[PDB]
Every structure is written in C-alpha cells, then in structure tokens.
UniProtKB/Swiss-Prot annotation, chains A, B:
Role summary: E3 ubiquitin-protein ligase which accepts ubiquitin specifically from endoplasmic reticulum-associated UBC1 and UBC7 E2 ligases, and transfers it to substrates promoting their degradation. Mediates the degradation of endoplasmic reticulum proteins (ERQC), also called ER-associated degradation (ERAD). Component of the HRD1 ubiquitin ligase complex, which is part of the ERAD-L and ERAD-M pathways responsible for the rapid degradation of soluble lumenal and membrane proteins with misfolded lumenal domains (ERAD-L), or ER-membrane proteins with misfolded transmembrane domains (ERAD-M).
Additional detail: Present with 2660 molecules/cell in log phase SD medium.
Protein name: ERAD-associated E3 ubiquitin-protein ligase HRD1
Segments passing through the bilayer: 1-21, 35-62, 76-92, 95-117, 139-160, 175-199, 218-238, 243-260
Deleted gene: phenotype: Impaired degradation of proteins with misfolded intramembrane or lumenal domains.
Subunit structure: Monomer. Has also been shown to form homodimers. However, dimer assembly is likely to be non-physiological. Forms homooligomers in a USA1-dependent manner. However, can function as a monomer in ERAD-L so the role of USA1-dependent oligomerization remains unclear. Component of the HRD1 ubiquitin ligase complex which contains the E3 ligase HRD1, its cofactors HRD3, USA1 and DER1, substrate recruiting factor YOS9 and CDC48-binding protein UBX2. Within the complex, interacts directly with HRD3 and USA1 and indirectly with DER1.
Gene source species: Saccharomyces cerevisiae (strain ATCC 204508 / S288c) (Baker's yeast)
C-alpha cells in the first residue's frame, strides 16, 4: 500500500504540473484542475493522506493497540459501517464525497473512543501498583480523553456555525449537517460518560488514599442514557427523514429500558 | 448491537404484517412493500442478517483469529475501503444498494483471504511437531482454501452468466458487473497463489519425508503477478472509465517491477 500512495502522489503532481505548464495564470490552472479528471486525482490523494494521518494519530495516542481493543473494534465496525452508510446514502445525490469524508471522520473517532474506554479499564487495574501515584498517573487518561474532547467540541462548534450561516439556503442540506452534529454530539456524550466514570474511579482512589460506589456508577450511566435519548428525540423535529433518524431514537429507547432497570435499583434503595 | 437487530426484525415483521392484514392478495402486499418505506426496512434487515452470518462464517472457519491476523486486517481495511468506494461510486446513480452489497461481499472475502495466508504460515511452522503427520494435517489448509475457492469460482461463474444474458441491455451496467468479475477474479488469483505456495511447501515436506526451493517460490510469485497484470490490462478494453481501472493496472505494474527483480535472480542463475 505504501507505494500505491507514492504513485498517487506522482500522478497528482503531474496532473497539477501539466495544467500549470500549459497555462499562464494560476486561475486558469485552478479551473482546469477543478474542472475534470485532475480534480478526482487530487481527491483520491487527499483521502489517502488523511488515512495515513489517522494511522499515525493512533500511533501517537494508543500506539499498538492491545488485542482486546482490536477485537472490540473488529466486532463493532461492520455494523457501525452499515448504519453510517444508511444515513449517508440519503444525501449522496448532492454531496457524496463530502459525505464520504464525514463518514470516515465519524468512524475514526468512534474507533478512538472505543479504545479510550478500554484504556480507562487498564488505568483502573493499575491502581494497586501505583497506590499513591494514581494521584498523578490518572492524567494519562486525561491525555487521551481531553484530547478527543477538544476535537469533538471543535467539530460541533464548526458544524453549527456553518449550518446557521447558510441555514436558509441549505434547505435540505441542513439535515445533512445537522445529522452530523447529532452523530458527533453522541460521541461527545459518550466521552462525557467516560469522563464522569473516570472521575468516580479517581474519587474511590482518593477515599482509599485519604483513609456504595456501584450506585454512583449507575447514576452516571443512567443520566448518560437520558441525555443521549433527549438528543435523538429532539432530532426528529425537522422535516427531512425523521423515519431514518428514528432507528437511533429507537436504540436509545432500548437503552431507556436499561435505565429503567438501574432506576428500579435506585428507587428500591430509596 | 444484538438487540438492534432484534428490534429491526420486529419492525420488519410488522411492516410486512400490516401490509398483509390490510390486503387480500399476496401481490397487493408484494407491491406495497416494494413500493415504499417497508422495502427499505426489509433491506436494512437483510444487510444486518448478512453481517451476522459473515461473523458466524468466521467462527466456523477461523474461529477467534490470532492477534497477527487482527493486525493485518486492521491495517489493510481503510485502504481497501477507499478503493472499493471509488469504483463503487461510479455506479451509485443506478445501483447504489446492489453496489453496496457487492462492496461488502468483496470485503468479507478479502478478509477471509488475508487470514488464510496467515493460516498457511501457521501450518508451515507446525511441520516439525507433526513430522510425518503433515502428510494428512496439511489438508487443514485445504479445508479453508478450497472452501474459499469454491465460493470465488461460483461468484465468477454467476457474474458472467448474468453479464452475457443481458450484455446488450446493460450498456453501462456491464461495466459494473464486469468490474466485479475482475475484482473477484483477483481474489481467485491470490487464492491460486496460496494454493501453489502450499503445494511447494508440501513438496518440500515430502522430499524431507522421502529422504533450491527459494527460486521455485519466486517462480510462483512472478507468475502470479503476471497473471494478475494480464487481467487488469485486458480490463481496460471497454469504454467505461478505463482511467478508474487504471489505478489497479498501475499497481500491477509496480508489482511487475518486483517481478523484474525476481526475474533478474532467475536469469542470473540461468
């Protein structure tokens, strides 16, 4: 594969070079490239470059990935892919390549988020060897979670600005981008859960170091389900394909059942 | 996820049931379902079912998958996905869901083929513990390879029949299906390589048991590259987007360079 990318570069260079050599003004070149085949070549090259970066970003964040992470990712992917493709298909007619881009972005982040969860478990397990040191060591989760948190927030902030700016012109495309807000919001919400769980885990450490948690853990997980449910439910307000959004609303309802079970335990305890 | 699928079933059932309850003839039902929303529901359900089967097919063939397989798969996937999507995009206008289906089929097989290669290495390594027994044990590769071989051949056979049958009507769609023949042929060719390599590995075993291989190994790998190159080159004959096919033709040319290196060693040896 590495060389496939090298060759794509060489083609891409020529494509530009040729348009350049055969023109006088950079604007003439700009169009020739954005007009035909050469644009598609550039697009392919960009996607390959993005992909290579995401692989690096894993190396700089998670490194090698543990078997257990590889397994969870492998299992979650084909279904993640179907569902993304379903919501994506809706707008292919107007935006296919932009949509394909966002499709990839959502995947790469979902993968990073799934991995992060497993990294929390690892840092929790190491508590006994660190003992006192967890006080500072736990920040290793933060230097994974926070980094993703910044990215998720930035995407949402940017999506919204764009939507508002052209909301009256993008009469259908608002749904494209507003769905993206929902999906990226869902990631931000899951990350918030991991934050809160981390906080409760650090809280237990503290109390031991200082020297009912189970229900505190449920309260976090129950709230999280509620918050996510509220998001997907409010998403059904716009006219464009509420029935397609509904598949996730319905999943959240299943989660709401799981909340019901946790709630029963809470209510019973009093 | 498991329950997402259960719910999809329940919806899908109702969708049909309702059309059924509210009709007299099965044909009225057939249309209502194939006419609107209910068709899409059925399509979603089918894709989920196919996915679950592919997961089972792994369990019945490769089981759990070794870390090394998980790693190779993980790394090869995003690029496999880009390139499939590129060739797929070309026909989305007329066939998106059929195309998406074939996209998934090509992936699942590529994954099975990548895994198979690694299973050959494992069976080769075990030679020393089996000693004499390799005589029969090696058939374990065959009960992986042959099974995929049957499937690859059947797909090709079926694709061709369909193409010929409607070749004069599918004036553009021939390219869709003919590209699929090429891609599935490429899998059949890679599998042929593994067969031949297995045969040469068994051949070495035999000679030891009976009691220059490196160049024999190269001759197989060099032929394989040639055969694949010839396929992709002949694929540029049809009018429809020879430039898109060209990306693989060009990759094969890179391989042809690798053949050149192996050939030099052969020519030198004489």
């Amino acid at each position: 594969l590495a060389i496939f990318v090298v060759v794509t570069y060489l083609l891409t260079f020529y494509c530009v070079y040729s348009a350049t050599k055969t023109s006088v003004s950079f604007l003439q070149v700009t169009l020739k490239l954005n007009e035909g085949f050469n644009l598609m070549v550039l697009s392919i090259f960009i996607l390959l470059n993005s992909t290579l970066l995401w692989q690096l970003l894993t190396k700089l964040l998670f490194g090698e990935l543990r078997l257990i992470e590889h397994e969870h990712i492998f299992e979650r992917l084909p279904f993640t892919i179907i569902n993304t493709l379903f919501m994506s298909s809706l707008f292919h007619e107007r935006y296919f390549f932009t949509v394909a881009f966002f499709g990839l972005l959502l995947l790469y982040l979902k993968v990073f988020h799934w991995i992060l969860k497993d990294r929390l478990e690892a840092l929790l397990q190491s508590i006994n060897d660190s003992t006192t040191m967890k006080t500072l060591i736990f920040s290793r989760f933060s230097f994974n979670l926070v980094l993703l948190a910044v990215v998720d927030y930035q995407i949402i902030t940017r999506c919204i600005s764009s939507i508002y700016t052209n909301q009256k012109s993008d009469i259908e495309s608002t749904s494209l981008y507003l769905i993206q807000v929902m999906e990226f919001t869902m990631l931000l919400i899951d990350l918030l859960n991991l934050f809160l769980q981390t906080c409760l885990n650090f809280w237990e450490f503290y109390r031991s170091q200082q020297s009912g948690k189970f229900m505190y853990e449920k309260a976090i997980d129950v709230f999280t389900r509620f918050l996510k449910t509220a998001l997907h439910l409010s998403m059904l307000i716009p006219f464009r394909m509420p029935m397609m959004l509904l598949k996730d609303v319905v999943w959240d309802i299943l989660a709401l059942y799981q909340s019901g079970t946790s709630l029963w335990k809470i209510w019973r305890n009093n």
